[PDB]
Amino acid sequence: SMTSHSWLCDGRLLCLHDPSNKNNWKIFRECWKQGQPVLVSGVHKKLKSELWKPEAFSQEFGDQDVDLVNCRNCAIISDVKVRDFWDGFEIICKRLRSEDGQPMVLKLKDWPPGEDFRDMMPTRFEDLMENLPLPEYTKRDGRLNLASRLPSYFVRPDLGPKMYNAYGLITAEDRRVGTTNLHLDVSDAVNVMVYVGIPIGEGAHDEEVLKTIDEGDADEVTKERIHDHKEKPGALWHIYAAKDAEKIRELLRKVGEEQGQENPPDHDPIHDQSWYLDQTLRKRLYEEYGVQGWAIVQFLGDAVFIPAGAPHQVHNLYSCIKVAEDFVSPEHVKHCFRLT
Numbered sequence: 530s531m532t533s534h535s536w537l538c539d540g541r542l543l544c545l546h547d548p549s550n551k552n553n554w555k556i557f558r559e560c561w562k563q564g565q566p567v568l569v570s571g572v573h574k575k576l577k578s579e580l581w582k583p584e585a586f587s588q589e590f591g592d593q594d595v596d597l598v599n600c601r602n603c604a605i606i607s608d609v610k611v612r613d614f615w616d617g618f619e620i621i622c623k624r625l626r627s628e629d630g631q632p633m634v635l636k637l638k639d640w641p642p643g644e645d646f647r648d649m650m651p652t653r654f655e656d657l658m659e660n661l662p663l664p665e666y667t668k669r670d671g672r673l674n675l676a677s678r679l680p681s682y683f684v685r686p687d688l689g690p691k692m693y694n695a696y697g698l699i700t701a702e703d704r705r706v707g708t709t710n711l712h713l714d715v716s717d718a719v720n721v722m723v724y725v726g727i728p729i730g731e732g733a734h735d736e737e738v739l740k741t742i743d744e745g746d747a748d749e750v751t752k753e754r755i756h757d758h759k760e761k762p763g764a765l766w767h768i769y770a771a772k773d774a775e776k777i778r779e780l781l782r783k784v785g786e787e788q789g790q791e792n793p794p795d796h797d798p799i800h801d802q803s804w805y806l807d808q809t810l811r812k813r814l815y816e817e818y819g820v821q822g823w824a825i826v827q828f829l830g831d832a833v834f835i836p837a838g839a840p841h842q843v844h845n846l847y848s849c850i851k852v853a854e855d856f857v858s859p860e861h862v863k864h865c866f867r868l869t
């Protein structure tokens with residue numbers, strides 16, 4: 530039967546089922562005030578699917594100049610065409626190759642650039658902004674979004690949204706690499722999965738994805754969404770409460786020192802955006818510092834709500850297109866205030 534919601538992460542994560550239900554705020558605001566992330570499923574059913582295909586981005590924008598990132602080693606591929614990324618999104622035989630002759634796992638950096646999404650793609654902008662869940666929080670002028678209402682004593686978010694496009698990580702060695710490294714944002718965010726590309730050429734890549742979810746600490750109900758309903762899984766997230774950020778900085782200062790890094794005692798390993806917490810580091814955070822997080826598998830059409838101040842990392846299972854909007858809820862405005 531249709532239901533309003535369910536629970537993931539053994540009851541620690543709210544999952545809302547109807548993205549446009551006018552009563553969602555009643556269930557949402559209790560979890561949100563406690564500093565929890567929230568998942569909302571089904572947003573893809575609200576969107577115009579033809580506006581979110583990799584072949585359309587390549588056809589319309591393919592002659593623009595861009596930089597890419599090699600996810601395996603963080604090398605920058607400078608001043609190539611955006612079609613060189615999009616044409617290898619699902620077809621592995623078309624990807625740019627490293628020296629070793631393997632196809633690369635690539636991220637498209639800062640595209641559309643800065644605040645230009647709305648000017649470059651007005652039809653995409655309308656389709657996303659009219660279908661975001663919890664619209665009193667997430668719309669530019671919603672009643673519970675303080676972004677446009679705050680003085681300069683507060684850090685305000687850039688005009689959005691921002692697009693996040695990257696290939697899926699493939700090998701057993703790739704299990705320890707991030708698509709986006711561990712970082713935090715001083716604003717709240719909603720991140721929507723608008724497209725998942727499961728490739729062909731090295732297609733049959735199914736079983737390394739199951740060992741990644743399992744070792745990723747995903748709950749038993751999340752493992753049912755794969756085997757039972759055959760939904761498309763895009764990305765594995767780990768999110769930590771804002772109150773645990775300093776304990777995570779202490780762990781990463783100790784590990785950087787063990788690995789022979791020579792850092793001052795106050796340097797900030799989260800702001801540096803240089804770490805991905807693999808299975809070894811996640812277990813050390815739990816055992817040695819007492820910190821538990823949320824392991825979240827984002828499927829096609831899932832919207833992840835990330836609280837201001839919460840450290841988070843992202844690992845693409847398959848090729849993903851994500852679109853995110855920043856906002857300033859009243860529950861978390863202390864995180865962007867400039868005076869301590």
Ligand SMILES: C[C@H]1CC[C@@H](NCc2ccc3c(c2)OCO3)C1
Nearest residue numbers: 684715771772838864865866867
């Ligand atoms: C705009 C910047 C000025 C200081 C920074 N805010 C630090 C902060 C405040 C409150 C917290 C917290 C961290 O962790 C839990 O509660 C943001």
Ligand SMILES: [Cl-]
Nearest residue numbers: 564771772838
């Ligand atoms: Cl908080």
Ligand SMILES: [Cl-]
Nearest residue numbers: 650651652653
């Ligand atoms: Cl458009």
Ligand SMILES: [Cl-]
Nearest residue numbers: 554663664665
């Ligand atoms: Cl709302």
Ligand SMILES: [Cl-]
Nearest residue numbers: 708709710802
């Ligand atoms: Cl990163």
Ligand SMILES: [Mn+2]
Nearest residue numbers: 712713714841
């Ligand atoms: Mn982020």
